[PDB]
């Protein structure tokens with residue numbers, strides 16, 4: 001086809017990048033994260049109890065207000081770290097940029113207060129494959145591909161630093177105004193997951209990690225770069241960082257002196273300087289500065305794996321190519 005559709009993202013604090021979609025007739029709008037690490041569309045249901053903090057603070061989809069809704073009712077569940085997210089399947093018309101698609105999505109009726117009540121967005125549009133869809137529900141980008149409207153069966157992410165355009169997703173191509181040079185591509189290890197081979201992770205110009213190869217999930221829905229607890233332990237030792245309960249930290253004054261961390265993907269070292277991975281909220285020796293790298297043990301079959309989230313994407317404009325089952329990175333502007 002002939003279309004590319006872009007959707008403007010708002011950057012909240014360098015951790016949440018979301019844009020709007022519309023569901024139903026007339027459209028009920030929702031701020032959503034576009035998440036290559038997941039495969040389902042989810043918004044909160046109007047059937048969600050107001051005793052869920054995550055529901056009270058978010059917009060709720062109301063099927064009783066949409067003329068185009070088609071009931072399903074199939075229960076679906078995501079076993080999230082802090083508790084179950086669950087709800088039920090519904091079908092409605094969803095608009096993303098200029099694209100309109102009839103889509104099955106989960107209406108969430110219960111989920112943990114944490115981290116969901118902290119989300120500035122209402123929902124999540126999974127950009128991953130049917131292979132990983134809960135209930136094997138056809139994902140949105142599959143439905144869009146089927147419509148034959150896109151210039152190319154790709155979508156791209158631009159995540160800005162904070163903070164001004166917060167970010168941009170492009171459906172059907174990329175946006176040259178937001179990268180420089182050309183893409184370099186890496187083949188997916190397999191179709192079904194936006195996961196590539198990584199050959200190594202270096203601190204400074206020496207390769208401390210992943211020396212015998214490892215996996216890299218490219219996960220637009222993740223705020224941070226993540227590695228297994230054991231990998232991150234070693235990285236943070238190499239960096240001199242201290243473990244807090246939920247993050248790692250350095251004295252703010254040594255932030256700018258932290259080494260380059262390099263990820264070796266395809267034929268390129270993708271290098272983050274300390275400016276890329278330290279939340280430099282002060283330069284004081286009296287304060288602790290958080291690192292935009294965290295431990296996360298992603299269970300099989302996806303994990304164990306590294307995850308390259310917003311931290312990585314802010315630096316490298318990313319194209320996810322369904323036609324060619326590959327991910328392309330270019331230096332973000």
Ligand SMILES: O=C(C1=C(c2ccc(CCCOc3c(F)ccc(F)c3Cl)cc2)C[C@H]2CNC[C@@H]1N2)N(Cc1cccc(Cl)c1Cl)C1CC1
Nearest residue numbers: 033035037038042043044058108116118119122123221222
């Ligand atoms: O933690 C996730 C992740 C995933 C995730 C995807 C869907 C869900 C269920 C739907 C939740 O819908 C939300 C919501 F995300 C936030 C508020 C809501 F009201 C609703 Cl209904 C939960 C987790 C999947 C997986 C790969 N990408 C990443 C991460 N791990 N997410 C939640 C999240 C990420 C970062 C900050 C915050 Cl505050 C949140 Cl809640 C989803 C935004 C991407």
Ligand SMILES: *[C@@H]1O[C@H](CO)[C@@H](O)[C@H](O)[C@H]1NC(C)=O
Nearest residue numbers: 071072073074089135136137
């Ligand atoms: C809901 O849609 C799914 C297709 O993914 C189908 O399996 C199911 O039968 C439908 N549910 C009902 C009860 O209508």
